[PDB]
């Protein structure tokens, strides 16, 4: 009876391996699509694109997003949708007796998923090139709570006499949880990936008042909410696709860990 149970467990583990592999392939295609979209977003940020070629790049991005939706909806292991959120947290028997199993989880990959991006905050007061950070107000303090629950606080000090773009570059360099940028009018766009924020993003410091920054709940933007007809659109798109790539890579790593555990378990069962 134990031998028959082991046969059943090996069959189930193999089926789980196959489902994991199919989902991994679909996720690989999705991340390749995301890389191409990141390249397009970076290209559009160039300041030599007038208006029409920006429209062409936006059309390319829209097509890529439609492809993302199609791959999310269609991937199926014989009628079993894998990336549309229907999979949930399934279970696979892994041994002879009843009680040993591994819960296979497959989070959806749709461009409307809330992990496919995050919160964006746009500066109220545009600043042109002539403007520089005043030496009087340089401190810029961020306070928020990450999804894992560990509160974070930063006290970035802006080097005096730098234009808005250099301030964005400095803020990007100082920390990784952010992706600062500037739009066409020079309004600082601060982007925080979904796993990196949970709650009200609150801001302080004289520099925040000077720039008009207002940290709040933020505008919720996923990959589906990307438009690259404007410079700020391109920059916040770079940030969005970076966060989405991180999420996709995390999911692929989880699937790989499950695959390795399945391989070890099947060897042990044999």
């Amino acid at each position: 009876a134990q031998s028959r149970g082991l046969d059943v467990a090996m069959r189930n583990a193999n089926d789980g391996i196959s489902i994991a592999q199919t989902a991994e392939g679909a996720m690989n295609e999705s991340t390749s699509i995301l890389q191409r979209m990141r390249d397009l977003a970076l290209q559009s940020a160039n300041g030599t694109n007038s208006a029409s070629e920006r429209q062409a790049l936006n059309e390319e991005s829209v097509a890529l997003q439609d492809e993302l939706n199609r791959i999310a909806e269609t991937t199926s292991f014989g009628g079993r949708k894998l990336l549309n959120g229907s999979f949930g947290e399934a279970s696979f028997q892994i041994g002879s007796s009843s009680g040993e199993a591994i819960i296979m989880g497959l989070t959806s990959v749709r461009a409307d998923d809330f992990r496919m991006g995050g919160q964006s905050f746009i500066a109220e007061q545009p600043k042109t090139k002539e403007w520089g950070v005043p030496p009087t107000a340089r401190d810029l303090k961020f306070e928020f709570t990450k999804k894992d629950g560990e509160a974070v606080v930063l006290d970035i000090i802006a080097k005096d006499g730098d234009d808005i773009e250099e301030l964005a570059t400095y803020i990007n360099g100082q920390t990784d949880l952010f992706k600062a940028s500037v739009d066409q009018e020079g309004k600082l766009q601060i982007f925080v990936a979904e796993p990196n924020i949970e709650g009200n993003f609150n801001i302080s410091g004289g520099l925040a008042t000077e720039l008009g920054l207002n940290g709040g709940p933020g505008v919720k933007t996923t990959v589906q909410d990307i438009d690259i007809t404007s410079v700020g659109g391109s920059q916040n798109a770079v940030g969005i696709i970076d966060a989405a790539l991180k999420y996709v890579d995390s999911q692929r790593a989880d699937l790989g860990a499950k695959q390795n555990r399945l391989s070890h378990s099947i060897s042990n069962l044999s």
Binding site: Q35, S250, G256, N260
Partner: protein, 54 residues
């Protein structure tokens, strides 16, 4: 000893042949594709860092 209904040595031979075939297929894939890590199973952290670098 000198059994009929069970062949343990054949079972061990089958298991080791299966291991050899799996390793052979993995090596063939790595040779053909040109990349060492094609799926997350080959390496998780390796795949993540490689994707970031690419």
């Amino acid at each position: 000893t000198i059994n009929v209904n069970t062949n343990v040595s054949a079972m061990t031979a089958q298991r080791y042949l299966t291991k050899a075939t799996g390793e052979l297929n993995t090596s063939m894939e790595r040779l053909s594709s040109g990349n060492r890590i094609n799926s997350a199973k080959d390496d998780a952290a390796g795949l993540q860092i490689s994707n970031r670098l690419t």
